[PDB]
Amino acid sequence: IPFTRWPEEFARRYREKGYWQDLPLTDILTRHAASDSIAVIDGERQLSYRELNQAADNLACSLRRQGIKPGETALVQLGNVAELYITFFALLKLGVAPVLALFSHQRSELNAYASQIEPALLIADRQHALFSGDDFLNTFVTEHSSIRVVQLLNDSGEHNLQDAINHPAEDFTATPSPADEVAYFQLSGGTTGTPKLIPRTHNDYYYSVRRSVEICQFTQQTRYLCAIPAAHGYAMSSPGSLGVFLAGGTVVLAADPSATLCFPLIEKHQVNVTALVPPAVSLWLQALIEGESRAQLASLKLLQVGGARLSATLAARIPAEIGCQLQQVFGMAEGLVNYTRLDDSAEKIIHTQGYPMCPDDEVWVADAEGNPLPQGEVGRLMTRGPYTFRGYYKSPQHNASAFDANGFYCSGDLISIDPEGYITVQGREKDQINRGGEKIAAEEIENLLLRHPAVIYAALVSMEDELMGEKSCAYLVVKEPLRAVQVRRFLREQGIAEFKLPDRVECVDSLPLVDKKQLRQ
Amino acid sequence: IPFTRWPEEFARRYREKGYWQDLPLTDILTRHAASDSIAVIDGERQLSYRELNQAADNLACSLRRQGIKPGETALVQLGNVAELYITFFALLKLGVAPVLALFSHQRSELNAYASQIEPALLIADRQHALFSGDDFLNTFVTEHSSIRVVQLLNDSGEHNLQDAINHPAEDFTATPSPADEVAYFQLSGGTTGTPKLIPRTHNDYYYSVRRSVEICQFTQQTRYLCAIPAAHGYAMSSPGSLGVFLAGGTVVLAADPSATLCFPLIEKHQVNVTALVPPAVSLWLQALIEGESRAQLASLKLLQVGGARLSATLAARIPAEIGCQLQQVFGMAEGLVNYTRLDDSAEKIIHTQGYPMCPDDEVWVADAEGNPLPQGEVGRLMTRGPYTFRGYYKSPQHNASAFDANGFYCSGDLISIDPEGYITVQGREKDQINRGGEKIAAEEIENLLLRHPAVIYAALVSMEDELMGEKSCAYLVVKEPLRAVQVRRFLREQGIAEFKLPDRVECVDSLPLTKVDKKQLRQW
Ligand SMILES: C#CCOc1cccc(C(=O)NS(=O)(=O)OC[C@H]2O[C@@H](n3cnc4c(N)ncnc43)[C@H](O)[C@@H]2O)c1
Numbered sequence A: 001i002p003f004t005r006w007p008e009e010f011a012r013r014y015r016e017k018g019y020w021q022d023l024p025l026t027d028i029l030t031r032h033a034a035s036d037s038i039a040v041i042d043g044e045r046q047l048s049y050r051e052l053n054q055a056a057d058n059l060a061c062s063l064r065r066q067g068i069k070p071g072e073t074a075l076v077q078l079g080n081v082a083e084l085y086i087t088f089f090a091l092l093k094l095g096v097a098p099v100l101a102l103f104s105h106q107r108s109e110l111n112a113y114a115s116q117i118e119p120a121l122l123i124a125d126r127q128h129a130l131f132s133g134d135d136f137l138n139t140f141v142t143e144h145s146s147i148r149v150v151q152l153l154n155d156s157g158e159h160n161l162q163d164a165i166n167h168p169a170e171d172f173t174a175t176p177s178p179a180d181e182v183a184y185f186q187l188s189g190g191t192t193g194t195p196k197l198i199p200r201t202h203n204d205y206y207y208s209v210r211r212s213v214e215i216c217q218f219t220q221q222t223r224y225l226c227a228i229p230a231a232h233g234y235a236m237s238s239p240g241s242l243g244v245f246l247a248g249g250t251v252v253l254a255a256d257p258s259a260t261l262c263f264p265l266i267e268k269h270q271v272n273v274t275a276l277v278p279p280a281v282s283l284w285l286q287a288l289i290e291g292e293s294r295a296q297l298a299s300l301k302l303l304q305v306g307g308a309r310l311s312a313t314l315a316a317r318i319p320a321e322i323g324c325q326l327q328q329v330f331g332m333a334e335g336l337v338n339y340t341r342l343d344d345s346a347e348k349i350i351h352t353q354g355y356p357m358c359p360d361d362e363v364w365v366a367d368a369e370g371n372p373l374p375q376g377e378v379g380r381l382m383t384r385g386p387y388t389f390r391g392y393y394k395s396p397q398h399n400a401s402a403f404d405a406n407g408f409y410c411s412g413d414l415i416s417i418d419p420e421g422y423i424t425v426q427g428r429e430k431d432q433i434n435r436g437g438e439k440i441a442a443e444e445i446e447n448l449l450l451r452h453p454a455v456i457y458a459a460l461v462s463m464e465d466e467l468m469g470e471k472s473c474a475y476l477v478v479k480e481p482l483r484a485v486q487v488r489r490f491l492r493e494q495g496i497a498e499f500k501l502p503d504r505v506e507c508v509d510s511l512p513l514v515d516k517k518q519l520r521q
Numbered sequence B: 001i002p003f004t005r006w007p008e009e010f011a012r013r014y015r016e017k018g019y020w021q022d023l024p025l026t027d028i029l030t031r032h033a034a035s036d037s038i039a040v041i042d043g044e045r046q047l048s049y050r051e052l053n054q055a056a057d058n059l060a061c062s063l064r065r066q067g068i069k070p071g072e073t074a075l076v077q078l079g080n081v082a083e084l085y086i087t088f089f090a091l092l093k094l095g096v097a098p099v100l101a102l103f104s105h106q107r108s109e110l111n112a113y114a115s116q117i118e119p120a121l122l123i124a125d126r127q128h129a130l131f132s133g134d135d136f137l138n139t140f141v142t143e144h145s146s147i148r149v150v151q152l153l154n155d156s157g158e159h160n161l162q163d164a165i166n167h168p169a170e171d172f173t174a175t176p177s178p179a180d181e182v183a184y185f186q187l188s189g190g191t192t193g194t195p196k197l198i199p200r201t202h203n204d205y206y207y208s209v210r211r212s213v214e215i216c217q218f219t220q221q222t223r224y225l226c227a228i229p230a231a232h233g234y235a236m237s238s239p240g241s242l243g244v245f246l247a248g249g250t251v252v253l254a255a256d257p258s259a260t261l262c263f264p265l266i267e268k269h270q271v272n273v274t275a276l277v278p279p280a281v282s283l284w285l286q287a288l289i290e291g292e293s294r295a296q297l298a299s300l301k302l303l304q305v306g307g308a309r310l311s312a313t314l315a316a317r318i319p320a321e322i323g324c325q326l327q328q329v330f331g332m333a334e335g336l337v338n339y340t341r342l343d344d345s346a347e348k349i350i351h352t353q354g355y356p357m358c359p360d361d362e363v364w365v366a367d368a369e370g371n372p373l374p375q376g377e378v379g380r381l382m383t384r385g386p387y388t389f390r391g392y393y394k395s396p397q398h399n400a401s402a403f404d405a406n407g408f409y410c411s412g413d414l415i416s417i418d419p420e421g422y423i424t425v426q427g428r429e430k431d432q433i434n435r436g437g438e439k440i441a442a443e444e445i446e447n448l449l450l451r452h453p454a455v456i457y458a459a460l461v462s463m464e465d466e467l468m469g470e471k472s473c474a475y476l477v478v479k480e481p482l483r484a485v486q487v488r489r490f491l492r493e494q495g496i497a498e499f500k501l502p503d504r505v506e507c508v509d510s511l512p513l514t515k516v517d518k519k520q521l522r523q524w
């Protein structure tokens, strides 16, 4: 499986300083293989580390019996369910490198993922609209001839994922990929018409998990509500579900981050940490004002907020109205994660997005041409480190643009740095809408909009929204009348995630040639 | 001299109803040839009709002696001076058809006029920057080889226009072009890169003058201040200087329409009518507020306003603050002139631009495709009538576009009509900036802007201005940032009128497309 390696001098330093431990990610679970403490709660169901490790082995063995081999890839689309974790560890024990699609994702995204990785395995859920029938599977498996095996959650036919998990492994021995080779693929937020995959080696991903666990002081006391899409890296590795497993804590799954669902779950399971995006924090605070009992969240000791900038106003209300510590998390799938520390001043937690998890995370701020700007100036985030990638999968064209001559990655983010060395997010250069923490590649939606017979020119831009931070607006130049329900119907046909449907559609007589900067004015 | 004739059924009707009298325009002056009453006041100088008609004959004879013949054309550039009228009548008595350039016009406009009409005669003013030396004349007369004779005002060399006017005609007899042939060329506001000339026959132009005199009730007691550029048709024919002459009144010339100049002239000469554009009306009302004596304007009985829409607010203040009747004049060089009547309700004079001077002026309002829109709806002005042309001079390309299949002319103006039959100007489709009543063909200035090494794309659009109604803004797509003083210096080099220099310059990375959306650019 090809990826961009670190230069040998960087790999040697990263090993010398103890970042790269040369252990597979499977070691996160197998260290607990003998333990009957609860690792995962999913409604009424409670899985021990012993059961979770046995399930992963069962499924690994079953897949090996069906002909899946090390160094092959897989497409996986499971939501906030126990089988997400079982599946991730099974494929890690086989040395199969998956993409974890979010439940929200549809035809266009699954097709794009399958086209780039040529998966030998597809794992999905009959609860997903695409997979309750066999029609789309038939098309999908024809168009993506790499796929040899289909396992399906909530199926009772020949393809039941449960029969695989419940079938006891006779004599199963793990073959994880080498620790310096690809373990799995993370999804980028997206800056382009086609999705870019991020190869993560075991050395690089395990370090990001292990160090996030040190900073967040996770232990076997950690009862972590995983309520955002579990397959995103913020929910998975910062420190996320893997960080909980590492520490021998308990992960409490929830279908979504609504107060209706999460308030009962926090009180019931005595949850002491969770991860939200700003609008969820807004909705929780409003729930408490609309009369929800504050005491339901008593056990809550740490609330992580990331994916988009938390307003100082909203930040300050967390300790007052909820009565736990805040942690700002400014991370990306490409690697770098900034954290506020548990012992930081109120000043730094409320007003900044913290600083890098690694001492050898390298972060400078660049002007338009590529020169370092002195501290306090606003510029482009340039980073590289021991858990930050060196290239997207099979993307020589884009990789040429995404990295400078020294292998520094440009996040497309505008930042400033304090005299104290803390990062504040000031703006964005990348053609990306951050809708409540969920990322929309504007070019992707524009290309779909131009496919409409009526649409001559399309621009997708953010507009300020109090709850969501940004909502999506399609500016369209059209041959004929075109109402917003027509654009949305059309985009659904093409098959994209709900969060990528324009919140607003405006037909306009003209657009400048599309120069987005001029359109904002 | 070739022009687009009216169809014979239209010409026969227009003669049958007395619109087309088949008399030359010279008849406007020659009817008064025996009169010693004052026709023109120009500073200290007062010309009788007797002297004016004798001057015109003198100059006509002198030009005939220098080899100018009937059916030839001429370029004339005189400002608000007596020699404008003398020259106009001389060329009419010879059957030479002129263009009357405005003083403000420069190289690019004169060149364009001379290129289209191939003039045998050039009459200009050594007071004009282009004519104080002999350099430009030498170039001009080389590039336009049709020119055989040059007469110059404020010259004391071989080409003195005064020696021609003062040289008494021994036995001179007039040879005006036929009344159904071209008498002269009017200038359009402009909708295109090169100027379009409007052929005016004697039948058609005389009617527009004669009928405007009936409506404005001009007589020998008409003392008319001509303070706007005298060679424009509003100042010349609606009813203007010719309508004053027709009626045997007096024309008082003024270099410009400033209160400083015109207040003294109105009191001194007991002026009872004048013509302004809205911003001049603004500046006059403000002059009175800044302490000018209202009594200076007592003699003023009618103030005409047109060229651009007068706001109801501004209109209402004229009777109150100045104490004369208002007349809204919505006209064009291509023919049609709408007037409020002297006996109209205050409601119609304040809020509307009146209705057509001719009963047989035909006016309907068209949608985007060309269908009639019902009574109070907003659309394109479509007109034809006995003083409205059927084509621009030597412009087959443009004439194909400017007229529908039935010979209706589109003014490029958006209008509505009252239930009472009165026109209100609502907007504009033609690519034209109306800067205080002065007209800028946007494409003309865009073509000059693209000539600049830095300029890739140019869009010229109007922006609202309180005084002027509209100012000009150039939107430019540039190889590097370019200051406004640089565009203006560059456009002056090319040689255009001051009023055509962009009031504002904006450098942008891109321009909006639908085809450049000028409507979007007005909204910034
Ligand atoms: C995946 C992964 C690893 O860990 C995390 C942890 C928390 C957030 C993310 C994340 O948002 N990843 S992303 O791939 O979906 O997007 C990266 C982008 O989100 C933006 N972002 C993330 N956090 C913040 C923040 N705290 N304030 C303003 N913007 C922000 C920023 O544009 C960054 O480039 C990723």
Ligand SMILES: C#CCOc1cccc(C(=O)NS(=O)(=O)OC[C@H]2O[C@@H](n3cnc4c(N)ncnc43)[C@H](O)[C@@H]2O)c1
Binding pocket: B186, B187, B188, B189, B232, B233, B234, B237, B238, B305, B306, B307, B308, B309, B310, B328, B329, B330, B331, B332, B333, B334, B335, B337, B353, B411, B413, B425, B434, B437, B439
């Ligand atoms: C030449 C001639 C004979 O008579 C006149 C009398 C008054 C004005 C004109 C004139 O402005 N002629 S023009 O060729 O310079 O421009 C024509 C355009 O000016 C505009 N215009 C003229 N008067 C008005 C008006 N009163 N209200 C809103 N717009 C207006 C309109 O766009 C019209 O098509 C011409």
